[PDB]
Curated annotation (Swiss-Prot):
Changing residue 64 to Q/L: Affects subcellular targeting of pip. Changing residue 84 to D: Affects subcellular targeting of pip. Briefly expressed in the follicle cells of the ovary, at around the time when the dorsoventral axis of the egg chamber is first established. It is found in: Endoplasmic reticulum lumen. Changing residue 196 to D: Affects subcellular targeting of pip. Homodimer. Interacts with pip; the interaction is direct and does not require pip to be folded. The gene is wbl. GO terms for cellular component: endomembrane system; endoplasmic reticulum; endoplasmic reticulum lumen. This is Protein windbeutel. It comes from the Eukaryota. Probable chaperone protein involved in dorsoventral axis patterning in early embryos. Probably acts by folding and targeting pipe (pip) into the Golgi. Changing residue 36 to S: Does not affect subcellular targeting of pip.
Amino acid sequence: TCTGCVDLDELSFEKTVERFPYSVVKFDIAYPKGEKHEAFTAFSKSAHKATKDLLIATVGVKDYGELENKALGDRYKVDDKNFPSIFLFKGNADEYVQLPSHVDVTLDNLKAFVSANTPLYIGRDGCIKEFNEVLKNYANIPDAEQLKLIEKLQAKQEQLTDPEQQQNARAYLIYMRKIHEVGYDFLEEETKRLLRLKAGKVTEAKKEELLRKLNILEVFRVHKVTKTAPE
């Protein structure tokens, strides 16, 4: 019944799914043991760390005795002969997305199932998904495109709500502006400064703020430098 996973049944399923904006629910046997269960469990804990908007829930389905949650199982066409079945909801118990059954049940595919199908994001502390989406090969894009992204992400920064999140966004833009100004050498430089900071006397909170900056700086790395300038 994994840590953090709310255990749901026929009277409570729909009412609870529909009070959350997003829900990921595992249908499975009653009393799951195994690697597929241990990964859900691991995903439960990681999810709880990254968000407050996401229900992580479980439905245990029986057929000895009084077949608990058989009805509920059928409501979702779940293959009793092929558990775990994993579903994502968006606040409507009538409309769901199913992890295809050929996908392995790992931490990382569970996170990718969520990122691909919602606004939400389960990854490294300090990151902001709508910012990562526009930022792939930032380092290599033309000067004019780079600045138009600055306009854009500055738009997004202005309307941001969480203290923390406002601050994640100031780091993104500081880095976007420096790479634009100085080029790709700013990564090696900033990385060296932050790690040295983190090798100092710091409070856990300062530590965690230093990991968010290194996490964000990480988004700007490119496999190959493809822009150069001049002499």
